Amino acid sequence: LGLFPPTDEQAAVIAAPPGPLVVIAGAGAGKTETMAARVVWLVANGFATPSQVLGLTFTRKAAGQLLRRVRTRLARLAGAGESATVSTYHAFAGTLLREHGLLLPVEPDTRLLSETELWQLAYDVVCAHPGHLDTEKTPAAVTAMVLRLSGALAEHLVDTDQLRDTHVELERLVHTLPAGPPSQWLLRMLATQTERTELVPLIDALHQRMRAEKVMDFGMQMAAAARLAARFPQVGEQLRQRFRVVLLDEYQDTGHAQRIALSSLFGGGADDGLALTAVGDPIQSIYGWRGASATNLPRFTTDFPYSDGTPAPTLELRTSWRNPPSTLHVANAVSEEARRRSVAVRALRPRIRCALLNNVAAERDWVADHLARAYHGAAAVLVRRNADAAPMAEALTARGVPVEVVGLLAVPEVADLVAMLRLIADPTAGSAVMRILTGPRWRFGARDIAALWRRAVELDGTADIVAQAAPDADTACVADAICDPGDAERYSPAGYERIVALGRELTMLRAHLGHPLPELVAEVRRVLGLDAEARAARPVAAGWAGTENLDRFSDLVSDFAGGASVSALLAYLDAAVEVENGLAPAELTVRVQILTVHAAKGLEWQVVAVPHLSARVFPSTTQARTWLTDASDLPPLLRGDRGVPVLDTSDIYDRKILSDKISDHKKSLDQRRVDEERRLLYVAITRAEDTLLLSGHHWGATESKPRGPSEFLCELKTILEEEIEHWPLRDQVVEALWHVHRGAQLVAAAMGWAADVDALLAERERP
Amino acid sequence: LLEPGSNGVVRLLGGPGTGKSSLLVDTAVQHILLTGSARLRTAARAAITARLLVRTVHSYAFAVLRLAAQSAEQDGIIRELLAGDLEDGGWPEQLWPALTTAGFATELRDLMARCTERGVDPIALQRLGRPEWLAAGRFAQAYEQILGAAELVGAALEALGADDELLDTERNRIKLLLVDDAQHLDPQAARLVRALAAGTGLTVIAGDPDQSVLLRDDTHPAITLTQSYRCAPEIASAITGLGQRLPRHWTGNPQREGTVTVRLAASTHAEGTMIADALRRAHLVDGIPWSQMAVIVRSVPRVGTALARALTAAGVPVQDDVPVGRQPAAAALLTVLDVTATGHLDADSAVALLTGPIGRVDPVTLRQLRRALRRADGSQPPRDFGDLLVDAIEREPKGLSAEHARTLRRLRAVLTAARRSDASGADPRYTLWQAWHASGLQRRWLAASERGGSVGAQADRDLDAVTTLFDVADQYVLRGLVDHVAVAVLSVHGALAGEWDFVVIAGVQEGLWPNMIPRGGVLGTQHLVDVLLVAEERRLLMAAMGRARTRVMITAVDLLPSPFCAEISAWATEPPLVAPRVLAPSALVGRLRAVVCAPDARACAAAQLARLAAAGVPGADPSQWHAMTSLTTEEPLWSEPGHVVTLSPSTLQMLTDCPLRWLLERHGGDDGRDVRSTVGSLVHALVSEPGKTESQLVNELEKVWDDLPYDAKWYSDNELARHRAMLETFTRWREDTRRQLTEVATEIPVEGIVVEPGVRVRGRLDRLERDEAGRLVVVALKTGKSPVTKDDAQNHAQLAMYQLAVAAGLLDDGDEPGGGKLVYLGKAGATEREQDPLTPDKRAEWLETVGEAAAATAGPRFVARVNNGCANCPVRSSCPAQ
DNA sequence: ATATCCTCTAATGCGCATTAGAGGATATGA
Ligand SMILES: Nc1ncnc2c1ncn2[C@@H]1O[C@H](COP(=O)(O)OP(=O)(O)NP(=O)(O)O)[C@@H](O)[C@H]1O
Ligand SMILES: Nc1ncnc2c1ncn2[C@@H]1O[C@H](COP(=O)(O)OP(=O)(O)NP(=O)(O)O)[C@@H](O)[C@H]1O
Numbered sequence A: 001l002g003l004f005p006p007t008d009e010q011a012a013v014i015a016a017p018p019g020p021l022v023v024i025a026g027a028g029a030g031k032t033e034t035m036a037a038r039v040v041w042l043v044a045n046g047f048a049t050p051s052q053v054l055g056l057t058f059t060r061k062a063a064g065q066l067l068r069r070v071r072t073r074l075a076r077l078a079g080a081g082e083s084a085t086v087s088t089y090h091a092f093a094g095t096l097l098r099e100h101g102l103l104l105p106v107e108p109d110t111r112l113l114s115e116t117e118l119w120q121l122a123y124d125v126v127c128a129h130p131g132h133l134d135t136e137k138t139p140a141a142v143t144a145m146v147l148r149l150s151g152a153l154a155e156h157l158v159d160t161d162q163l164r165d166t167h168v169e170l171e172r173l174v175h176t177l178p179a180g181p182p183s184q185w186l187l188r189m190l191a192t193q194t195e196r197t198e199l200v201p202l203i204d205a206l207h208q209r210m211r212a213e214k215v216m217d218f219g220m221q222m223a224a225a226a227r228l229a230a231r232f233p234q235v236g237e238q239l240r241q242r243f244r245v246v247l248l249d250e251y252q253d254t255g256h257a258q259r260i261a262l263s264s265l266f267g268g269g270a271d272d273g274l275a276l277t278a279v280g281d282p283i284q285s286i287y288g289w290r291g292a293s294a295t296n297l298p299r300f301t302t303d304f305p306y307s308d309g310t311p312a313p314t315l316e317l318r319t320s321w322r323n324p325p326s327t328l329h330v331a332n333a334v335s336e337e338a339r340r341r342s343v344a345v346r347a348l349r350p351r352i353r354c355a356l357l358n359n360v361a362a363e364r365d366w367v368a369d370h371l372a373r374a375y376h377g378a379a380a381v382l383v384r385r386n387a388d389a390a391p392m393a394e395a396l397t398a399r400g401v402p403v404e405v406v407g408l409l410a411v412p413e414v415a416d417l418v419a420m421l422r423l424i425a426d427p428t429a430g431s432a433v434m435r436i437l438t439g440p441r442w443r444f445g446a447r448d449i450a451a452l453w454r455r456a457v458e459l460d461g462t463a464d465i466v467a468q469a470a471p472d473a474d475t476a477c478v479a480d481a482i483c484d485p486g487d488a489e490r491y492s493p494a495g496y497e498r499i500v501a502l503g504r505e506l507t508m509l510r511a512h513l514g515h516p517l518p519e520l521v522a523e524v525r526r527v528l529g530l531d532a533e534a535r536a537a538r539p540v541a542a543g544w545a546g547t548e549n550l551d552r553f554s555d556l557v558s559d560f561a562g563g564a565s566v567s568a569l570l571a572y573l574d575a576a577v578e579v580e581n582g583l584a585p586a587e588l589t590v591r592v593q594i595l596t597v598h599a600a601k602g603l604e605w606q607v608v609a610v611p612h613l614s615a616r617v618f619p620s621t622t623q624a625r626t627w628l629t630d631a632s633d634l635p636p637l638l639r640g641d642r643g644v645p646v647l648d649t650s651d652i653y654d655r656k657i658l659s660d661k662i663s664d665h666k667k668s669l670d671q672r673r674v675d676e677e678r679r680l681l682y683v684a685i686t687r688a689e690d691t692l693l694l695s696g697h698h699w700g701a702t703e704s705k706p707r708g709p710s711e712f713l714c715e716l717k718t719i720l721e722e723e724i725e726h727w728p729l730r731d732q733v734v735e736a737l738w739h740v741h742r743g744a745q746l747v748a749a750a751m752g753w754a755a756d757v758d759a760l761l762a763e764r765e766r767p
Numbered sequence B: 001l002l003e004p005g006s007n008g009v010v011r012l013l014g015g016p017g018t019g020k021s022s023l024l025v026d027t028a029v030q031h032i033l034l035t036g037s038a039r040l041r042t043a044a045r046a047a048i049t050a051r052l053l054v055r056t057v058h059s060y061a062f063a064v065l066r067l068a069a070q071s072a073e074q075d076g077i078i079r080e081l082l083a084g085d086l087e088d089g090g091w092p093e094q095l096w097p098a099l100t101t102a103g104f105a106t107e108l109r110d111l112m113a114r115c116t117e118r119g120v121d122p123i124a125l126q127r128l129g130r131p132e133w134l135a136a137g138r139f140a141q142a143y144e145q146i147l148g149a150a151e152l153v154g155a156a157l158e159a160l161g162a163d164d165e166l167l168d169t170e171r172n173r174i175k176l177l178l179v180d181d182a183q184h185l186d187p188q189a190a191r192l193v194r195a196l197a198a199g200t201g202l203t204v205i206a207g208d209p210d211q212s213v214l215l216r217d218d219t220h221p222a223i224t225l226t227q228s229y230r231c232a233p234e235i236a237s238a239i240t241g242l243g244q245r246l247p248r249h250w251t252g253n254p255q256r257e258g259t260v261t262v263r264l265a266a267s268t269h270a271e272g273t274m275i276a277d278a279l280r281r282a283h284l285v286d287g288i289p290w291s292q293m294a295v296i297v298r299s300v301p302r303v304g305t306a307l308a309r310a311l312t313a314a315g316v317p318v319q320d321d322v323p324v325g326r327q328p329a330a331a332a333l334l335t336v337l338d339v340t341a342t343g344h345l346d347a348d349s350a351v352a353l354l355t356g357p358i359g360r361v362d363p364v365t366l367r368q369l370r371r372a373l374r375r376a377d378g379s380q381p382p383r384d385f386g387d388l389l390v391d392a393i394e395r396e397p398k399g400l401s402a403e404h405a406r407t408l409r410r411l412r413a414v415l416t417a418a419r420r421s422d423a424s425g426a427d428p429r430y431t432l433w434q435a436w437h438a439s440g441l442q443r444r445w446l447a448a449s450e451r452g453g454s455v456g457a458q459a460d461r462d463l464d465a466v467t468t469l470f471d472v473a474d475q476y477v478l479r480g481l482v483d484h485v486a487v488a489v490l491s492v493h494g495a496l497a498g499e500w501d502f503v504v505i506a507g508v509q510e511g512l513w514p515n516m517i518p519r520g521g522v523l524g525t526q527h528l529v530d531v532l533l534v535a536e537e538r539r540l541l542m543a544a545m546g547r548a549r550t551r552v553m554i555t556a557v558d559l560l561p562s563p564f565c566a567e568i569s570a571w572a573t574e575p576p577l578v579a580p581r582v583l584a585p586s587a588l589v590g591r592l593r594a595v596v597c598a599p600d601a602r603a604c605a606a607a608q609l610a611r612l613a614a615a616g617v618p619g620a621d622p623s624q625w626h627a628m629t630s631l632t633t634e635e636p637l638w639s640e641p642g643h644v645v646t647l648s649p650s651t652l653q654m655l656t657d658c659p660l661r662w663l664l665e666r667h668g669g670d671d672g673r674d675v676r677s678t679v680g681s682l683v684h685a686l687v688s689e690p691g692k693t694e695s696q697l698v699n700e701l702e703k704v705w706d707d708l709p710y711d712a713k714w715y716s717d718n719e720l721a722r723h724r725a726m727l728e729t730f731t732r733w734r735e736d737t738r739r740q741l742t743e744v745a746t747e748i749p750v751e752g753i754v755v756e757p758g759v760r761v762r763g764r765l766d767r768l769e770r771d772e773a774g775r776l777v778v779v780a781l782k783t784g785k786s787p788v789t790k791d792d793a794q795n796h797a798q799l800a801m802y803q804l805a806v807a808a809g810l811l812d813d814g815d816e817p818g819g820g821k822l823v824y825l826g827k828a829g830a831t832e833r834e835q836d837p838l839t840p841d842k843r844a845e846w847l848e849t850v851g852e853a854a855a856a857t858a859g860p861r862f863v864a865r866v867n868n869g870c871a872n873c874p875v876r877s878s879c880p881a882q
Numbered sequence C: 001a002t003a004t005c006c007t008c009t010a011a012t013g014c015g016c017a018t019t020a021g022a023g024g025a026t027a028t029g030a
């Protein structure tokens, strides 16, 4: 219908008879392309009504694009010979809870918590625990463990009861058993195991408090929906009647809570007339730590049966479409080890520049040069660590290429609103005064800061020491010298008028502290220069948009106070800074992209480079801990989808055997993460469409000894050789010393915008 | 058909805005009624009085019920019934877990209400059996055996037809029946009207069957109307074009000139901005007054909440939520009432009075008041501010009072009036009003609401809350009294009684306006309603569009435009906006500045900015730009010849790391003192004593640990158990090295000169000891957990300054270099990091480093080198190097 | 004028526990 001619292999998937179906073979063989084109075949031909279609995707952008593609195809087919419902998994779980929330007793009016509010609630519950933890950690550091255990449990449906017998049956092997030849090291593992059962009451009280306040989380909604699906068969028999065709995209990364909720409503072996299609490959399953389900590709042929025991069919659909050769050879050779570990695919058939520089600066220069010579004379880069994203723009901006890189509270126009709101609330935050006193407004000099501090100190055993640190102790802050500057002989004449103006402004603004919260942040922004200087710092090519995030902050403040502005909205923002790493960047309208590998799933670009491929950075062997070292790890004996082998613990008669078993268990669990990293590299490579860039560096940034290139580079060099011949760290330290002027002259000499200006003048001068 | 001499039933039909109500009032006047809303009846009565029994259906039902005698309460009743009906053992045996929930009560009440509306008996519901409906009917029949506003019409009708004489008398007492609203009338009201219109006179049933007595299927002659009188022909054309898709012909007013337009955004902010842009341009350029525009949205909570906030920022007024107790202004008197009831002033109940509206002090004035009060009671351990506050309120402190006396006097007056007036009169007449009169909070807002749109708004809202609290107190007749306590954006359903020259239909997205959200449930209420939709929402869109006579603006985003937008675009009279223009006075200045200061039209923009600045418009003058400001001082910190600077040894490794960090970490710039700092200082003080045993130190620590600001009281015991071990390991270390060194002084003050700009070292050595060789080692006890490395501890700036002082006299001993030690209490014993004595070769290097560091604090323009310690410094938001 | 840390790993001295230093403190839907 005016689009691609469907291939012979895709033809079978396109017009497959109603019933469960699996699609495989991965990296460009036309999976999402045979979704709208299969909906239209099941709509225009017949067999369904386009109000009975349900499609599920992980990210909401994919849901939106699928909806748009489907509607466009349907509209085009309406001219030759009631709309679908497309939503993400968690949104559908929320809808299911809203419809049938009274069966399983959860109020349908239940609110959903963010990450910051969840952290605040968990922190209060942890700090309000009457008992004796007997742990060496701190609050806000065991909260980061409670919030992780309570996520893993609700992800694997464990309900905190079986967790109380985890250390038992294991501590006897280290005490009762005799040595064959305490070890001072197994005791650390035991002290870790005795931490889950120690903190079970914390994650019980947290759940109780969340229930008592009619709020839940992202990770509890799916658990509740799955329990509702499994317990009550009366909900599936209604949705199956409402929906006749169901599409499950990106099914490789779906979790365990979403696997028994999508197998109880649809395809529990109940109806063979429901056209149910699932797509995905077992090789691009990269998360492993979020959905924590390496299964669900093999557990489909026995999970959605024909209502008579026959396994559902899987169609190969092998053809390489989005991958040119000489970049598909690398993709099919770098993941050739999956011929044993995760066997569910055979191969796919078809329709490069590598560098090893001796330091990070040279590699940055090399990638920037290669990405500029294809721009100046006439794309994306995939960084695994987003902290590495911003660094590699200075070596690229100097080339002249326009630079696009992808924290709400760190924006220079919003960070001056969080301050001067912290200065108003408590006059003891000295870090919110140095930001105001030294900002572009009222640039105070060093001598005047010293004079202010001298006035501040002028204004000012073993029990007098503890007499401090009280909430009402005097600490000689600098915010009460602005309001009592003293005699105007210690400051500069130009620095006393500014001090008096600041004092009067703060005095006016502090009286507006009993007013409603949303009407205070909108008044400070009025008093400050914001909403005018924010626009004046924007290029003419942008247009009129200068207050996007500066307005979304006010919207978020109003959402929060739906409030005290001292106890709240300042502890809340400091919690959001450390927990959410800035609330939400307030994305632009929308150069070479910058995004991370995990955010580059199921997409395509022209020139894609995986820049940093040295050791310890891309494989990321650091900060990985098994289930026997940290408490919040959910031992595999009670985790769903048990890859993730379980140690037998029933064939040990001496301590040496137990030590060997533990060691090989740790080695296996580490090889699991290595395989996940290889899958990540496979995902990164196949997004090419064209020439590809692979690079690695010898000397990093903060290392006493050089680090070699990773195993990925050492394998890709062999692959390309069967490549650019590019095969005392540093002590330089950067330091910074503590148009507008030209354009101001025209305005100074001056004394369809004319109509607007005269209308505004008439409005202002008409009392 | 409409004459004083007439009989029978007549009706007039069709047309939105045609003048049905005007025709009805004209017939009523010419012959010498019903309205359907408590607000519409006022307008009808006003019109009738201007031209020369205005009631509603429920009011008429109540009146007839009263003559026949010659909502939280129902929710509570049903909740109590549900709570009772769970211990006894006819629900379908699956609804037991949900019975105690608050979401089942609302659904059950709604099901009962919709059963009542259609005129259904509980036995009739029990005849529908699906055991859920049987149980609901049994619940309803039990509820009846145990009145509201939902069954009022039904009860009134049931009371009728039995007397057989009241109905005839009422019919004879009515000569004209004017319902004025029959398009949306409940069947009980319809049959009540039909019975009341058996014979009389009359009995006009006008209504409007196009938008869902009876009209569609009935006898008697009917009148057809076609001229709208309140809609432009283009608007009517769009409405009828939408109507030719519904399972109806009328013309607008030809004298009007209209416009129907469709707009699409690129973001939610874009839509919320162009709506305000259009409203502002319509008010200012076109010149129509306020209250003639309106924004109509499907649901106020879903969309209107953010739209109003994004719209009021552009200068467009909105005519426009919290309980009486939750208002701080009303709670100010509630706290006074509570204090009077108790009779004693609490500690946390005084800061609330000092902060609330009764006496207002900003936090800096709180610090000043606290300092001025603590200067009276000069105890060595300062007393808690709350404790002094009550004493100051009760007894006047003569030590010092300059401007804080007025606030305390006002609080004295309020409290001394309230606490005595309650020892006689009743609460509402002697507590609240006497407190209000005693407080000066009536002559301020009265002269302050006149001026200022910001302070005046809070004054008005606070006064309204105070009046509401007073009314509630009056309706409550002291402990029991305290215990008991413009453009108008609105929903489609509220958009049915407006003129609204300009209507902006907002939020017409494909996800919300055609409501794909299912309307099912557990009780199956909708199945009962249907047994006993896109085309449905099209009528709502039609009704919303028909309220506007001049301009309709249908706004959506592209979050996706619904097919209704495409349908409307066929009868309308461009890429979506991404940067929509505004008429805001703070946006014109921004755009003009952005275009002037760019890498032809510059002269025009400069002229516009000059004209703006000549009449105010903040942000316009070149001197008011932020980038054009100048440094205040730009003069060195010290310049006199022969000046000597003082360097404490703890802030030398910070001056050789980042001089800006030194400048701004001191001189204010540290946002506070953590508990770890005071705990370390306390342990240092305990250790510093020279004649105390370990048990004495532990007891002293335990006696004062209680007064520490630790949250998580399970942590305030772990910390105590850790620092007891800290003291124990210090004592073990001291006993271990007794035979190898020997202490000479403890906490000895170091002060002197090391270079002649001169450098004046000043500090407090923690422990000074001496060896068998006569040297003087230096010990700096540290309570940290992670010791520094040996290759770094040999370059420690703190110790290298201490053993620099011991050279050339200073500490009044043999003046030998000695050595250096760094003991880490906490982490076989306490870990000790050593440092060799200052050799004459290295002493020169350290003197050079001290001299170079002392010259970086001289003038302005301090350097900010990036360190490995940038992750811990509070001065980061003001650091240019980031 | 007074101090960032948890954790995993490598050397080492009397095969295994103790001490010291280097490097990272990921990737993140709804
Ligand atoms: N019949 C076809 N003719 C031409 N191009 C096709 C055809 N089928 C698919 N493609 C292209 O091949 C690529 C496959 O991508 P897409 O259809 O989005 O599924 P996909 O990329 O494989 N999703 P995933 O496998 O999960 O990464 C796209 O660039 C399609 O436009
Ligand atoms: N003869 C007339 N001369 C002048 N204006 C008239 C005349 N008849 C009606 N109008 C005007 O028409 C309007 C009457 O609208 P109205 O009676 O409210 O119709 P409606 O049926 O109530 N539509 P609705 O508001 O949805 O209920 C008013 O603005 C009257 O001023």
Ligand code: SF4
Binding pocket: B658, B660, B661, B864, B865, B866, B867, B869, B870, B871, B873, B875, B876, B879, B880, B881, B882
């Ligand atoms: S962040 Fe670094 S450079 Fe900036 S002030 Fe702090 S220590 Fe100095």
